[PDB]
């Protein structure tokens, strides 16, 4: 396989389906990347069995414990966790702000639990990342135009530093890919300047950053409407941190190819199970004697084998197996959503799928 | 298969190996029964993959949440948790004392979170138990001779009530088995009276009760030396709540056929991993870069796939996957211990195995 080749097989409106080929495997797009030293409560073989082609590696957590240098000495993240397919690593930038006494500078971020663009790229190399994210400065929402422009402009300077660090490391440049991140908050002219700056630098894929920040779906969709067409059409478009199932459908209708979020895993452990008729909270007493699977059509192993009543009891008792089964199902449901999206685009009926999906999911 | 048939295939000294045939499957003896609405952090297929033929069902937990009647309405414990092989259920007697404002009477135990012998047998029927334990009164250690005799005598009256309740329920008597429990603390004459009383009533198997209570291995072995020969030779001998690997080896040398305890699961979640060179605490810093499997010879899936260093990091971070992997390995190690015991007895070299095991395990 090549280092990186994105091929679009079918289109319907702004939606696309196709494949990214990389050394460690093929990624079917639109793709959902489960977030994980683990994808919580799941063995890697189980993540793969649900249909995931690629996972997202949480860099901020790993650079602290067990540390990037240690993981490198132990053979890299793939060997460490036992996942031999592609891994996309975030840059550490967002969580360094959300989770750390930070001091921001043009050089980078200094924090207590210095992360620069150069160090972020090096850490992702040490982890053995297949898709490396440029290191950027997250923009809070809401943001004033001046603050959004300043942060975006710094992020574009850091995008150039990220590109150069990546390219200067021969083994990384020859075996991994690098994505740039569009910033600019909700302002169309800043999104355009960022898209232009990233395209001048040149990346293997382009992320739409700064939209998983509590602005609401109407505003997110409005911003995607003008922001995705600014990105190069022949490269993957990655919406970072999104999202709920209807968000994903709407984002694909607007040209997005790649997705990640913690919602299926986190809310799974919290007792929320996704179904084609909308989410349910399995903790509710009305499931205590319900012998049906979590979802009536889901093909996952959990829905083949256990009832709502059993999982309700496990989650009520705080059982680890409750978290395992809820997470497997939710992750499988997301992958089955992506498969239905990919198939419907391939067959030129994605518009009808989106309408049918929403009618039933919000009924 | 018959309702119950215990067949001894080979003997060496007091040790025996053979099989219990039951409707739901065959149990290889000596047997170890993992303790579990779940065997914590493991799917049933994983418990089976480690080699378990039978699990122990925790009655006290289940009669509270979700309740025995509810589990019966949902189809019984096998269907509920997805384990289709034999299940031995304890009577609820021990945990009603350890975990509950108890009031003991000749009728039974009244408690806040009335459990009589009749109710305990009924609960085990409602759960769909394959091996039903008679309901007895646990004896504290140490115990005076008078108190040990009183408790044993009450337990023998409750053994008769347990037998009659079991036999009066046609579907239970025709499809399940019933074990009686020897009591009498550490006193040889009380152990003899209890063994005689149980044999007069007649049971499918005989448990040695009251020895998982902190008396130490020397005292336990001394009591097993005279207590096991009092039990019928042609029926299984079940040492309740035992124990560490060397305890199990010593108990088999003294005629025990069946074992349960929480140690591999509980201490697994605590970071203790069993190996043929003794237990290790994977949390210790000396494993942070150790690429070897938990144990060098173990055939389990965890030791095929992940390093000590990875599991060390998972347990340090409180990850659910850490508990899953530690538990699978420990449960597999116990089953591999039982297999080595069974094979060595079958081959007339169990004495040499016990000596070799101890030399290496305590080296
Ligand atoms: Zn499912
Ligand atoms: Zn192992």
Curated annotation (Swiss-Prot), chains A, B:
Cofactor(s) this protein cannot do without: Zn(2+)
Sequence segments annotated as region (RNA binding): 241-247, 265-269
Organism superkingdom: Bacteria
E.C. number: 2.4.2.29
Pathway noted in the entry: tRNA modification; tRNA-queuosine biosynthesis
Record: active site: 90 (proton acceptor), 260 (nucleophile)
Catalysed transformations (reactions): 7-aminomethyl-7-carbaguanine + guanosine(34) in tRNA = 7-aminomethyl-7-carbaguanosine(34) in tRNA + guanine
Any one Gene Ontology cellular component term annotated for this protein: cytosol
One GO molecular-function entry: tRNA-guanosine(34) queuine transglycosylase activity
Keywords, sorted A to Z: Glycosyltransferase, Metal-binding, Queuosine biosynthesis, Transferase, tRNA processing, Zinc
Zinc keyword on record: yes
GO annotation terms (biological process): queuosine biosynthetic process; tRNA wobble guanine modification; tRNA-guanine transglycosylation
Class of enzymatic activity (EC top level): transferase
Cofactor note: Binds 1 zinc ion per subunit.
Consequence the record notes for mutating residue 91 to A: Strongly reduces activity
Residues noted as binding substrate in the record, renumbered to the chain: 90-94, 136, 183, 210
UniProt binding sites for Zn(2+): 298, 300, 303, 329
InterPro entries: ArchSynthase1/Queuine_TRR, TGT, TGT-like_sf, tRNA_ribo_trans-like
Family: Belongs to the queuine tRNA-ribosyltransferase family.
HAMAP family per record: Q_tRNA_Tgt (MF_00168)
Quaternary structure and interacting proteins, as annotated: Homodimer. Within each dimer, one monomer is responsible for RNA recognition and catalysis, while the other monomer binds to the replacement base PreQ1.
NCBIfam families in alphabetical order: Q_tRNA_tgt, tgt_general
Function in brief: Catalyzes the base-exchange of a guanine (G) residue with the queuine precursor 7-aminomethyl-7-deazaguanine (PreQ1) at position 34 (anticodon wobble position) in tRNAs with GU(N) anticodons (tRNA-Asp, -Asn, -His and -Tyr). Catalysis occurs through a double-displacement mechanism. The nucleophile active site attacks the C1' of nucleotide 34 to detach the guanine base from the RNA, forming a covalent enzyme-RNA intermediate. The proton acceptor active site deprotonates the incoming PreQ1, allowing a nucleophilic attack on the C1' of the ribose to form the product.
Protein name: Queuine tRNA-ribosyltransferase
């Amino acid at each position: 396989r090549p280092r990186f080749s994105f091929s679009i097989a079918a289109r319907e409106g702004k939606a696309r389906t196709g494949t990214i080929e990389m050394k460690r495997g093929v990624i079917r797009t639109p793709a959902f990347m489960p977030v994980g030293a683990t994808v919580k409560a799941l063995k890697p073989e189980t993540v793969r069995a649900t249909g995931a082609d690629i996972i997202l590696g949480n860099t901020y957590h790993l650079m602290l414990r067990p540390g990037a240098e240690r993981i490198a000495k132990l053979g890299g993240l793939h060997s460490f966790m036992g996942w031999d397919r592609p891994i996309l690593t975030d840059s550490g930038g967002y969580q360094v702000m959300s989770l750390s006494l930070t001091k921001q500078s043009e050089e980078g971020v200094t924090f207590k639990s210095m992360l620069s663009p150069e160090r972020s790229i090096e850490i992702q190399h040490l982890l053995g990342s297949d898709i490396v994210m440029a290191f950027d400065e997250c923009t809070p929402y809401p943001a004033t135009p001046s603050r959004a422009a300043s942060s975006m402009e710094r992020s574009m300077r850091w995008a150039k530093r990220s590109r150069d660090a990546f390219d200067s490391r021969k083994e990384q440049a020859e075996n991994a890919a690098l994505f740039g991140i569009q910033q600019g908050s909700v302002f169309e002219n800043l999104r355009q300047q960022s898209a232009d700056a990233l395209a001048e630098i040149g990346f293997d894929g382009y992320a739409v950053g700064g939209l998983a920040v509590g602005e609401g779906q109407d505003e997110m969709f409005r911003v995607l409407d003008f922001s995705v067409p600014m990105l190069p059409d022949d490269k993957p478009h990655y919406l970072m941190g999104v999202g709920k199932p209807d968000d994903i459908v709407g984002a694909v209708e607007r040209g997005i190819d790649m997705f990640d979020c913690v919602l299926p895993t986190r809310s799974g452990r919290n007792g929320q199970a996704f179904t084609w008729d909308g989410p349910i909270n399995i903790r509710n007493a009305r499931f205590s004697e319900d012998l049906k699977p979590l979802d009536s059509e889901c093909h996952c192993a959990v829905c083949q084998k256990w009832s709502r009543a059993y999982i309700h009891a496990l989650i009520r008792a705080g059982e680890i197996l409750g978290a395992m089964l809820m997470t497997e199902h939710n992750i499988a449901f997301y992958q089955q959503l992506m498969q239905k999206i990919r198939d419907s685009i391939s067959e030129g009926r994605f518009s009808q799928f989106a309408q049918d999906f929403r009618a039933r999911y919000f009924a």
